[PDB]
């Protein structure tokens, strides 16, 4: 994801002399003894790298083909999403096929239980939603989106929705079970992650948001509570409860207080930039051990967010602070992720200079942290929750509201 042509200010079909002339022009501009502004040095190097590729016919051809490969990969990803989105899977299991073992986690809307498939012995994580509660909390459209979207996406860091079904009382979403627990509990116990450790997680979220956004999807509930650690130490994003397909802007006030972008708080029509703001909060909390805006009452949290005055621990690197100033940018029109160069302003930021983006995508990087275990059903990486009886009424509830589920 480097834009060599744009770096030199060129069109894709530029000639060799145009490439030479553009490199020379751009070079003079950032030359170390005629430009001593911050990061001019880093641009002087980027212009040289772009020239070395484009000025060599073999390497330029490789780069041009790679641009075509990426476009074709995106076309297949859009195809796969649209086919699944336009004709959603339904009714792919039912309740008494699963032995319910233990509650793994709860949220504002649902209960997630470790279950075991009676026939195969395989373990899964089943999210249970009470239809009447969903209606009361005004989450009908959100819950319909959640299921429809999660089973239509496919990415290495997105949890898989394996089965779904419904009965008189409840909605059920049966996911792959991610056994290493929430990032949240590890982060709180450990205190904070070192910058390379935080960067490892951050890079997975960057690729995941690049993927979702390329399908016109926004996620809207990034937080360590919704991030699970798998057996290889990689991230699995769960909780698509606020995921939505948006071309243009959307208007719902939703999210989790510490992670709300300012434009959501100010009731503005907002877009994919809110996900990039949330990434700033996540990276800050991962590396500091506490979020950039906190207070006892969410009203006071919201007042801090929209001022967006932010202070950094003195142990934060200069590159980390610079990245965070650009992600935690209160003006969405200036926020990294939302500029002309899109996700590349982030991927090519200095703080990510050591990140091998293709190796992260391929899961070839050794994780900084591997969760401990003691068996295929061990749950000790999760807190304990009070257990509650799953009751199914003899009368169907909210039949019309959830017809498409």
């Amino acid at each position: 994801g480097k834009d060599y042509y744009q770096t030199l200010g060129l069109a894709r079909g530029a000639s060799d002399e145009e490439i030479k002339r553009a490199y020379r022009r751009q070079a003079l501009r950032y030359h170390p003894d005629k430009n001593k502004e911050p990061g001019a040095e880093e641009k002087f190097k980027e212009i040289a790298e772009a020239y070395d590729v484009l000025s060599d016919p073999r390497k330029r051809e490789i780069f041009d083909r790679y641009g075509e490969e990426v476009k074709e990969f995106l076309a297949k990803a859009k195809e796969d999403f649209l086919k699944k989105w336009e004709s959603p899977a339904q009714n792919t299991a039912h309740l008494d096929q699963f032995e319910r073992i233990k509650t793994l986690g709860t949220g504002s809307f649902g209960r997630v239980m470790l279950v075991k498939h009676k026939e195969t012995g395989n373990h899964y994580a089943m999210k249970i939603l009470d239809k009447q509660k969903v209606v009361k909390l005004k989450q009908i459209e959100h819950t319909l989106n959640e299921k429809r979207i999660l089973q239509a996406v496919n990415f290495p860091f997105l949890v898989k929705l394996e089965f779904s079904f419904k009965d008189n009382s409840n909605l059920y979403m049966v996911m792959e079970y991610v056994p290493g627990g929430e990032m949240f509990s590890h982060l709180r116990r450990i205190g904070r992650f070192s910058e390379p450790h935080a960067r490892f997680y951050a890079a997975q979220i960057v690729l995941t948001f690049e993927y979702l956004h390329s399908l016109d999807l926004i996620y809207r509930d990034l937080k360590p509570e919704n991030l699970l650690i798998d057996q290889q130490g990689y991230i699995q994003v769960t909780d698509f409860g606020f995921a939505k397909r948006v071309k243009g802007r959307t208007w719902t006030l939703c999210g989790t207080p510490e992670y709300l972008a300012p434009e959501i708080i100010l009731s503005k029509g907002y877009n994919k930039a809110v996900d990039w703001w949330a990434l700033g909060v996540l990276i800050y909390e991962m590396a500091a051990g506490y979020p950039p805006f906190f207070a006892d009452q969410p009203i006071q949290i919201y007042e801090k967010i929209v001022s967006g005055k932010v202070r950094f621990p003195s142990h934060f690197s200069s590159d980390l602070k610079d990245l965070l100033r650009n992600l935690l940018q209160v003006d969405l029109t200036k926020r990294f992720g939302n500029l002309k160069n899109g996700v590349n302003d982030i991927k090519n930021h200095k703080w990510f200079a050591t990140t091998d983006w293709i190796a992260i995508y391929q899961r070839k990087v050794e994780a900084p942290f591997i969760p401990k275990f003691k068996g295929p059903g061990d749950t000790s990486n999760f807190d304990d929750y009070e257990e509650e009886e799953i009751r199914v009424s003899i009368n169907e509830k909210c039949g019309k509201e959830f017809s498409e589920f």
Partner: peptide, 20 residues
């Protein structure tokens, strides 16, 4: 210190989404 203030604060536990 700020981390000290945070771990002695009221919002160190899991944060559920807003239902508003």
């Amino acid at each position: 210190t700020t981390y000290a203030d945070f771990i002695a604060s009221g919002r160190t536990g899991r944060r559920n989404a807003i239902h508003d």
